[model samples]
Target: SRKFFVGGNWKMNGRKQSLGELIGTLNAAKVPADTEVVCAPPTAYIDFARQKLDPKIAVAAQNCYKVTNGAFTGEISPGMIKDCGATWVVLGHSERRHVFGESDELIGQKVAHALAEGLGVIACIGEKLDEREAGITEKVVFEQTKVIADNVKDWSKVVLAYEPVWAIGTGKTATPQQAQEVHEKLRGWLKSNVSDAVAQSTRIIYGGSVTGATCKELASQPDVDGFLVGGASLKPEFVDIINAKQ
Candidate 1:
């Protein structure tokens, strides 16, 4: 069965002191045993996060480079992340694409490189508000997924995060129905393009203004596996979001 996965994206937030307190809380929180919990901190915090988090909870990097090693200044490589004790990484996030100019090909390379180094990936794909309003959400998302799928043959090592660009940190969330429509369509595409087994096993999670109040409804969607929480991930309510299913 596909395990439910919830990830906390502490994007550009938190200090060592705050992170330590959060780690203590998470270690004590009653997270569902069946749910796979992963947290992505800034690259600088990966080692500290890994050391503080419970063994069941994995640490991830917010971003990484496609190359194993090189002169890409200010970029973290997959090999470096693995060496830092991080087992997962988030790629293709809308912020990276919009703010940092990461192309689909670059994201694909990152996926392949991460998997090559035995690191799991949360591969994000989604459309902007205008694209969704224009009725091309599926096309945009499919194109994003296609690049990663084409580059990485081992789908087992990646989790697809369907984080609608419009919904991210904007306080505008895709309703459960809207989220499910896209998720189901993506699964159908995956079933036809990849394998049925992969389609069945892959965890397609939702992101964007996700909160404790909104997560339970979204998580109930048939195709919605869990969440890639953003803003609320930094607060005490994050525990509620992780336990939304319960």
Candidate 2:
């Protein structure tokens, strides 16, 4: 069975000073034993987080490039982050897609590269509000899924995060049923298109407007293995979200 997982997307929001204080609070929280918690800090703070943060709580990079080393000036490579002690990376986030125009192919390349360099991945995939409204949610999501799925060589190194673009940072959320519906189908798709073992073992987590109050019921759903929290991740409430399984 998939262990419950929670990932905090710190997304360009943390300063070194406040981040240290935040990590201290997280260290004291009674996080569930079975739940795996990861926080993706800004790339610049990877070393700061590694040195001061709790070992049990993993630190992840918000993004990384498809190459280990190159002339890509602004891009951070997976090796650089791993050396900074980051154990995971969040790829294909909505911002990378909609705001920066990262194509599915490009995101897929990043996933493959990150895994090859031994970093775990929180691979995000979702439909926009328009796509959802058109009832093509599965169609769009599956298209993105195939891109990453095709590139994955190890299921254990990746956690799939379903973060609807419309809900992300908008204070809107997918109902527990809504989340489960997509996750269940995602697993089914993996079973049919990938493998039974991959479907049974791979973790599929929810993201977008996930708060502590809503986390419990959402966590209760059979298919919702965990969460990929955004704004709330910057606050003390994040600990509550981490302990939702408790």
Candidate 3:
């Protein structure tokens, strides 16, 4: 079975004192030995998180530039992320796509480069509410996923995240069945386009308002191997989400 994977995306939030307290809470929590937990602090705090967070909990950069180094004014490269001791990166998050207008092609390049830089990728793909209402959810998701898949040479280093844009931070979550349906389709996409083994092994995790209250049912889904938590991850209750499997 794929190891349970949970990632906390701190996004553009967090200050030195607050992050330190959150790290302390996680360090003291008894996360299951088999569960793989990673947390992404804002770019400026990658090293801080890596240093203060218990080594058992891995650190990830929320986003990174596609290249190793360049004059890309505000972009941080994958190389710099690794230098901070973070071993993973969350690419193509909904906020990046919608708020910042990052394109699928650009996200794919970042995934390929991050993996090449030896950082694991929590690659995100999902459809908007309008797309779901229009009955083209699969088409949008599949097209977005294709770019990431095309860039991937190794599935082992990637944990595909399906976080519906509509559910994200809106205090809404896809119903368990809704999340499962999309994950199942994604697995099938991998089976036919990549290989059966990759489909079975690649963890398709859920995100979007995941909390302790709703985690159990979501975790019960066979294809819902883990989560990419947002707001709740900054609090003590995130421990419950991390140990949802237990």
Candidate 4:
């Protein structure tokens, strides 16, 4: 019921020059019309990527603040992101959660503000290796999802991303079955806590070590609507992943 959605989170890497070249590559690559592609470049280049990349490949900011404007020194707001020509944003990424120590409350605030300002949200959630090993994976995932879900007034504006902290940047890709299991549970959570329409329409994408080699199998799973790609998204193979459904 949801369209395939692939998001490239370029993270903190890439300078203006290098990112331009990457945008050139992405601009020329053709993808399926039925699949949606979005690139989350570093904040500095969100405007540049939006200007240079093909319009079919929408641009998303890597992150944004909860408020429109304030004394939040180093943070940019959703309004600023919209001014930069990006129509979406990636929030609660694992790095933002574990690395920067962003709490569930902060992420939910950001999600709510972003959607309120008409920007689409790529709402991320997942567990750590320890949490998974301890068999609290579902609990951790559901809790994270709950906070994000509580903020989302419109499911269509959100794409739930399941990115296990341990698997991210570790080259430890989750097997198709592993990803599917989580996605299915996440959807069920939506059905019960949200509504049948929300559950059926929300795109639940997987993140964490999604390379071209692994994307096809992951995409084969009915629940894996698409990917929130990390390192691989910066490379040319991102095209292959974007076209995995083909």
Which pairs clash inside model 3?
Answer: none
Candidate 4: 10-residue stretch with minimal lDDT: 165-174
Query: Tens digits of per-residue lDDT for model 3 on 56-162?
Result: 99999999999898889988988999899999999999989999999998999999899988989999988887787788988998999899999999989999999
lDDT of 3: 0.91
Off by over 4 Å in 4: 169-173
lDDT of each: 0.88, 0.90, 0.91, 0.90
Kindly give the number of clashing pairs for every candidate: 0, 0, 0, 0
- lDDT score, residue 229, model 1? 90
Top lDDT: which candidate number?
A: 3
Candidate 1 vs candidate 3, TM-score winner: 3
> Residue 87 of candidate 1: its Cα lDDT?
86
Which of 3 and 4 is the better model by lDDT?
3
**RMSD to truth, every model:** 1.3, 1.2, 1.2, 1.2
**Which pairs clash in model 4?**
none
Model 3: lDDT of residue 200: 90
TM-score of each: 0.96, 0.97, 0.97, 0.97
Candidate 2 wrongly placed segments (more than 4 Å): 169-172
Note the residue pairs that clash in candidate 2: none
In Å, residue 66's CA in model 1 sits off its true spot by 1.1
lDDT of 2 by residue, 1-246 (tens): 789999998888878789988888888887777989999888788899888878899999998999989899988999999899889999999988999999999999999899999999999999998888799999999999999999999998999999878665555667889889999999999999999999999999998678878999999989889999998998999988988788
